[PDB]
């Protein structure tokens, strides 16, 4: 209680809570798991618009 | 040298408890203190902590299951059944 904050923490994120091998394993999965959904979200909107000209292009075919 | 003939870990108990109840306990006292295969981490390192609790000494993975052996033979029958039944829905 009487000590400075520096004997109980360290200068980076989650310092004094998490270690160096798992601060980085959260930085890496905060990037790779967010970006994996962006690949699957933009794949989903690209599929529904290809449906929007697979059948709306059949208005000029019968 | 070789220290006993056929009482292995059960030589702990001496001339007690009957020959065959030492032998039913022998296959499961050997099994729970043997290190099993960490399929997560590739190593032979699963040691049982408490009853039903296993822990890869290389991978620090804690797996529930099996009182004296890591995977009981009724589990692998179940894992195949769940894997088959999720293929019929996809």
């Amino acid at each position: 209680r009487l000590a400075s904050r520096h004997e109980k923490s360290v200068s980076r994120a989650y310092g004094g809570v998490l270690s160096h091998d798992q601060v980085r394993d959260r930085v890496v999965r905060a990037f790779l798991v967010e970006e994996q959904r962006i690949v699957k979200q933009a794949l989903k909107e690209h599929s529904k618009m290809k449906l929007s000209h697979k059948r709306t292009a059949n208005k000029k075919k019968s | 040298a070789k220290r006993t003939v056929k009482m292995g870990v059960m030589g702990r108990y001496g001339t007690r408890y009957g020959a065959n109840p030492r032998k039913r306990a022998k296959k499961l006292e050997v099994s729970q203190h043997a290190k099993h295969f960490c399929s997560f981490c590739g190593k032979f390192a699963f040691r049982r902590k408490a009853v039903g609790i296993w822990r890869c000494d290389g991978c620090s993975k804690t797996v529930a299951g099996g009182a004296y052996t890591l995977s009981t033979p009724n589990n692998s029958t179940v894992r195949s059944t769940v894997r088959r039944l999720r293929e019929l829905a996809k």
Binding site: - | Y13, R16, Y17, P21, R22, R24, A25, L28, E29, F40, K49, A50, V51, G52, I53, K61, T62, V63, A64, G65, G66, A67, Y68, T69, S71, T72, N74, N75, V78, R79, T81, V82, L85, R86, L88, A89
Partner: protein, 254 residues
Amino acid sequence: GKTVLSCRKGNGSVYQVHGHKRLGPAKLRILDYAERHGYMRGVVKSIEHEAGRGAALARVEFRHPYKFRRVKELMVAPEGMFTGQSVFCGQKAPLAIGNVLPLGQITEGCIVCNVEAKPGDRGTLARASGDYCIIISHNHETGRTRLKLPSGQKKSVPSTSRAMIGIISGGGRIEKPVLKAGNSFYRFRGKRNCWPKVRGVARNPVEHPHGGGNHQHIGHPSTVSRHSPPGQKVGLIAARRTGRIRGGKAVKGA
């Protein structure tokens, strides 16, 4: 002339459970809106032993549905449950080991555990170590699922009652002999006061109906009626048949 020991355990004084080192009650998470319509995902953080069970527990971490917090949930684990697993929980959850989904959604012939006998009571059937229920059929007119309990006794339950998928963890336990009265001391240490077990014939006639005599014999026939009073109902209570069961294996129960 004095009160029988089996009648005395219902006062529950020296004979209550030994629960100080127990964790909380193991149950499924609350059947909220988030499972009646979607799935909640959790994550297994620890596999736990409490005193007086042979099955492993698990703390699964959900997010609270309505508040900025996370809910620690103590479930009893199936076999193969590892820390990190991402349990899914609800209607739209897939069919995998560890997931908890309604019995209407689990296709037939599937091994389930922590099945609940009415919707919402958070798991009452198949929770001892190594046990499981098998789903036999579904009825869509009545909306009920009929499954085989671990005794073999069938039971029809509503198809909105959910169940976890798997064997209960910690199985194979009874197959090792105890070998010692010391090892039975510590087995019943975290349970309750019910050991050592003194036979009724070893007692005096004041304590038990079987006690007394010059030879240790039960005098009267030891199969008592269903309608015997407390104190008189000791022995083989309402035995339909006795003796060494020579033949098949009848399911026991009403």
